[PDB]
Amino acid sequence: ADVPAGVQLADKQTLVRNNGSEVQSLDPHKIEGVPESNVSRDLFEGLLISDVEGHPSPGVAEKWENKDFKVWTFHLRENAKWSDGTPVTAHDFVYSWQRLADPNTASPYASYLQYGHIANIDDIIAGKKPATDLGVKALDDHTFEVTLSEPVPYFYKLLVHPSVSPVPKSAVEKFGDKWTQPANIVTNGAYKLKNWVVNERIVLERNPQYWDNAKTVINQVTYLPISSEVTDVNRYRSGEIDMTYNNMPIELFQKLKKEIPNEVRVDPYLCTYYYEINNQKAPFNDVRVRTALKLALDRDIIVNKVKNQGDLPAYSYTPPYTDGAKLVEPEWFKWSQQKRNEEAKKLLAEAGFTADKPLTFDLLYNTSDLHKKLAIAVASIWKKNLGVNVNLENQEWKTFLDTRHQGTFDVARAGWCADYNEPTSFLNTMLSDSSNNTAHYKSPAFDKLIADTLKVADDTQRSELYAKAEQQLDKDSAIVPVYYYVNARLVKPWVGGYTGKDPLDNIYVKNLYIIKH
Template sequence: MSIALTGPKLGRMRAALWFTTLLLSTLCADVSAAADVLRIGNGPEPETLDPHRVEGVSAGNIVRDLFEGLTAVGDDGSAIPAAARSWEVSDDGRVYRFHLRDDLRWSNGDTVVAADFVFGLQRSVTPDTGSSFARMFEPVRNAAAIIDGRLPAHRLGVQAVDARTLQVTLDAPTPALPGMLAHPSAFPVHRASLSAHGSGFARPGRLVSNGAYRLAGWVVQSHVELERNPHYRAAAAIPWVRYLVTEDIHAELQRFRAGELDITYEIPPLQAARIRREYPGALRIAPYLGVYYYGLNLTRAPFAGKPALRQALSMVIDRQVLADKVLHGLALPAWSFVPPGMHALEAPRPDWQDWTPTRRQAEALRLYRQAGYGDERPLEVEIRYNTHESHRRVATVVAAMWRQALGVRTRLVNEEFKVFLHKRRLRRETQAFRAAWMADFNDPMSFLGILHSEHGKNDSGWVDAGFDAALMRAAATAEPAVRANLLAAAERRILDDVPVIPLYFYVSKHLVAPRVRGWRDNPLDYHYSKDLALDRAPGDR
């Protein structure tokens, strides 16, 4: 039997056939293109690609591909040459000279010069920029006064000696300076683009960068697309990099299993054992200089002026259970704020760490009652966190520990990442809140500095004159032993006053597809796409 197709029916069939053909050709194109595209799961939506305003890990990952600092991070976490081919330091440790490579270009072909790095550092410490990392550069001459608005940015102790030489003058010896300059807040920006577009300069079609890649596209809540920068001094092996938003870690794992991702942002702790069996060669777990903690808002009730309450809540949290049971061995218990191995001397730890559970709980209950709470008047508190399965699980277990040991009534509040950051930092609409910190450079100051009373990341609003003074003295001394003692004393004040509750130290945990070559674990978990390559599947051309 034959059927004649005429009029509207034929039109609809032709349209359906055209759509099917287009869909198949698109899918085939995507599969073919995947041979030249590195697909990276990147967690939450990046908040910005302005290097001086970047805050989150996901944005930092992208910005390190787009831009290049004077230095980069090597396999052991130390500073290695990047835009600067070499540097030297004066005998007194207060003056650094960086020598730029001869073949540096912006993604539009303009020459990169020392003055671009000078401008980048000046912009980073200018109050109007709003960089959360400005205080990191306080060792640079006049930086503190500029950050406080007492001096103009051009007074910063950084100067272009000539087009290829940059000099940094410090108030005190700072051995960590080369590592600090690998951070996005020290990156240069293209001055003409910033002048033309203002705060919108870091968008597709406008962003001019100096790294191995340039910005090709950005689809909000989907992905950021990078393409190889034709003007970079050494062409990257991979022509395209796609950073995908993967806030749902279970969905991310499914995409990896389906071959849609080459690198995951992390792995679901609940599936750790299965993943170890399923992907023994692809799973990469390594030490990572990062701490997961709960910040406590000290600017309002219930935590303002209540160190005993804060200590009680910290004491009854079983960190070992969090690391072993909730995170399935993908973390280390955190009894201090600075990760192990970073202090030159033995790291401080709370006196009650080695107490029996019974003794610890009894003391916590005493402190809880001393703070004015008990069975008749239980503490009611919220834990706020950005949407993520692991954050929810940790909050649920901590709330259960607080309830069982002290009778605390806890409300859990989850929010989209940008909303969470806004309420936590700008409006301080929090009580207890999830937070994390990853080292910007391999030194205890990278962690302790964020709790300085004037640091942009001090979301607890903690003010402790003794702590601030210890950090300032540590920054001003050239004697390693004296500096180490001062930093240890500063951390002891954190443990005693409890503006934050450290919960666990991170390990990096990624799935890396077999076709990715060049991956190397490092303690800062920095991975530059330009250092990677892709094996082609049979039949790829």
């Protein structure tokens, strides 16, 4: 943290943050969500980290170079240490990225190494080559060299993500899946795990071995697993919570903007809210069904009447304000809702659905005030505009993500947030073989368009390819875009260090501080 001169610090430097749900895991290779990553950034530090405004900055690596954007050399600071006092070395990174790549680990982010094009990743994922063949090596204890199969100019931007953080081999091997328990875990971020009470709280305490420990101000941070946005706001207003999760309750949000204006933070966020269609399951494998659902949903009603928290109606997967996004807004989005409804009805009738043989399916969402209220409204809108019957089903976060990966669903509420600010952070998840492809979407055409983006050596051709890829996705109605999120949350007046300038919202508690109040 960089405490501005003049600012008087509170005697007690403790923070309470709501985290939206119980984390899937604390193992960097077994996580795929925002809640998981929120805690991960305080415990495990990779090569680079985001500064307080989101710029890729030195993490364990203090300096780095690239040769033709294909060979990246990271110089690790000598004083980087784990919480047990042992050094963080390039060997830790070699082991960790190999473990991420290894099919045996079954990481949901195994494809992150494909997104970065680390040499030999495809064969390793397919079981054709051993994970030790991965294009990473330790040149010495403080030098990590990564070799890519093609030039990736934005490669370093990917490195702030949890999947490429180091994990302690010793603890993993000795304790297996219980390596993350408080008594066994070893961490290299600014914090250490103190307590972990499932469905109650995660308590982290300052890690004195952290290389930048002298700049850390918060001594303890508690992460809560409250999925009810109304409850989160209530516990924030009662004084228990210092920072709510960034999912806002439809019930209380208007109230709040008027009641506590200076505590309501609303900033740009690179995330898209959509209804994910299981593309490999009939009748959702029929593009006419998918298109009907996409068109019959009334974004104006949901976004501006039902939710109205500052969101913008969406027509794409990649947010249009992503760095490098120059998207073509589709004609259907410009039409009136009545025209969209008419077309939707025509397509469904073409697909075989009638009044005595209607389309009935499930709408899966993770427990939440916001998602439930929106799902009820969408169910109503689809029933009214298309004559479709939807059965709502809520699941807790960890179960919900597993269900989507399994493909044991029809339609699911979804929200993807960028991992790095570049269109492929979104687009790569729709690749036929992506480990993040819960849409179960497989398009050779789409795949080829993305493949071509690193075969050109200029941003204009690349951006046009991203635009065409979104057009392909939209043509196939892979998803039902709803709105582009805004990062809205409540932050107590005494919490300093939160700028809201980072569109990826990669917060580190080491950068925050409590002002005397």
